[model samples]
Target: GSHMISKADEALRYYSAQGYTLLNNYLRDRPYKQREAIDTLLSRSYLNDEPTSAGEFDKAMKAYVADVEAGLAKLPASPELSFVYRGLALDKPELAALKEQFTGVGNIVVEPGFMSTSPDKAWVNDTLLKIRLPAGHGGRLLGDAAHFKGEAEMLFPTQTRLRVDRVVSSTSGDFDTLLNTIPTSDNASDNRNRIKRLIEVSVL
Candidate 1:
């Protein structure tokens, strides 16, 4: 048992918080099942070309998106001015390709971006993203909305555009050179052999 929560876990919390209270009680300890439901509902939306769709699943996905957007609508107009983090595992060539892509693009939009309030180095052990958010940002503050509130998740919509600020890549053990500018309590030494890239981006 541990405190680390996955993307689907966070989605379950968000879905339960916004009008799906029945799920909050039913899936209190059934994280795996909850993820199954999240995937099913999300998959319905993912396949827009499908001719037929289930009523309940379609309704669930619609309400999920609408309610989450409504919650985000309540945020203050001024930028929040904070930083969030995300991590991913990638091979050396993929990391290099991503770095090149970031360099080629001025801004990027990650569909339903998942980020944490703090840089949990232990959990985010690969390619690190240090995202700078302004006061009036598009991210939904999932503090009270989260199941395991300690994860400190902030959900961003699919359309939330981010401007790349900096990029650093390392195929060697020089983890400090990659994590030097981030706020964290640990180093990337444990995942020393993995190809790593540190990307700094700002919410635009």
Candidate 2:
């Protein structure tokens, strides 16, 4: 029932490519289940049979950490970009859930962080945070326009602005509670129309 290290390595690679990482506490909470999954994966040949004599697993884990660190290091020093990447990387799962819920037009735009304290910064922040809209308009949107600004930190490295737009026509109404129920008197009027949802993310 032992999992071949190669099989486990492959799963790690798959999840890694998708930007999924093993949480530090993953094993602490459910050692039994983790072990079971490993065993099952091994039994099904989801992993390799080699004993990993070369300490390859450790190297892989180290590489993963290095990649994450590299991502952080490459991020712009601007507070806005830092916040944007932090939110996106940390809340990818929630973003995906939002995408699944909202099924309509949505957009994400990232721009340079303003050096002055102006309404635009607030506007941008609000836009990035808003995730629901009125019915007939759309719902369950996961907005990450701020992520585009953080694209400067991407592993590939590019100077181009980051802009992404998507429309999901099946699950936009899933976020009516957060966007509609709350007061937006101080926020921009457009916040009412933006859907904030994300369905998929990977760290690799």
Candidate 3:
């Protein structure tokens, strides 16, 4: 479809305008560039590859966060008015621990930092998240500003405290699980690779 095709092209345009030429070229063959790719490329290069001078990588992160903050300012304020989704691919123990915590504490506070989210549930991952927001408090609507313009990416600045609502049921198996196996000479070895869960929550 042209829609999907142009999104990839537009991503290069968007990042190119932002002076991320290396990133632009790296993502040329991707279906469409998104924030995850931006974070992975910048952070990975900053941490292990790039010989960034003192505070240079931090400078870049600060710039990205600041840009999102500025974009956040452009949004209209409202209460109980928006929903975003996130997905997490977790191992059995990690997934179980999270579910237990949600059941026990009834809430979770995201660590203080920028968290990327999407207005729609089109992301690929295991544990699914449906989070409600207060419109503009800590959320930035990155429409045309996004790498893929139509992704409707939303940036959550600093933190978003969430309280669990009710979990949704679906025939697709909302509470999903998978047996990760590896081939061996004698037989297959069963390993816990990933599990999935879905939860709904509201901002606090």
Candidate 4:
């Protein structure tokens, strides 16, 4: 029981630190801090109706009690630490030959006169920003995308096999609709919102 309690406390603090960092960034950027869209979310925090304080994030994890946390209420940890990372923009394009198509059947499509591709290795200014994802969210971070002083991904010791993943979003699904169809899909509502298929030119 004690072991599980410690693990839960560790998780609580990990997410607390992560959430605080991201929320503070949103506060600093855009009209988010002034918008009702954000105002609605902040008021629901465990802090209740009190005004939100950026400084209070340091005290955020102190009250999340564990099961046996019975009498072992945690005191505020002094000298709390947070991580810092820097981003440097690449001066040249590292991607090449951008091509993509969106189809209703959830796949890339290339039809005569309906497809296009960019000239190979064109100059495209794309910044690489890598940070830990929020809890329960997942995304790809290609190892071949960026580098720093012989360092892979600015953090890896070297280029990794993930670079083999250069083939971005080359995914396909299985279905038998094209089987003897009338050559096209139809009968959809005008009030529909669905991203049936997605393909990216680059940065998949």
Which one wins on TM-score?
1
RMSD after CA superposition, every candidate: 9.6, 17.0, 12.0, 19.0
lDDT (10s digit) by residue, model 3, range 1-204: 654533234433343346353333332322444355446545534334442564665465445444445545555543444677776654367467656655444667453544567765434444566776754466665546534664556655455577877554323343432111111122123633222445667777
State each model's CA lDDT, in order: 0.54, 0.31, 0.50, 0.25
- Superpose all Cα atoms of candidate 4 onto the true structure and report the RMSD in Å to 1 decimal: 19.0
Q: Which one wins by TM-score: 3 or 4? A: 3
Residue ranges of candidate 4 with Cα displaced over 4 Å: 3-21, 27-46, 50-87, 90-204
lDDT of 4 by residue, 1-204 (tens): 654545444533433333333333443342333343333234434344443675453243233222113221242321222111122223223312112212122332222110111111111112111122222211211123222222221111111111111111113342223111111123244733222212121111
Residue pairs clashing in model 4 are none
TM-score of 2: 0.23
lDDT for each residue of candidate 2 in 117-139, tens digit (9 for 90 to 100): 11122222212332222222111
Which stretches of model 3 miss by more than 4 angstroms?
Answer: 1-68, 75-81, 92-105, 167-195
A best-first ranking of the candidates according to their TM-score comes to 1, 3, 2, 4
Q: Which pairs of residues have clashing backbones in candidate 3?
A: none
Q: What is the lDDT of residue 122 in candidate 3?
A: 36
**Residue ranges of candidate 1 with Cα displaced over 4 Å:** 1-60, 75-80, 92-107, 112-122, 144-151, 171-178, 188-195
Worst-scoring 10-residue span by lDDT in model 3: 178-187
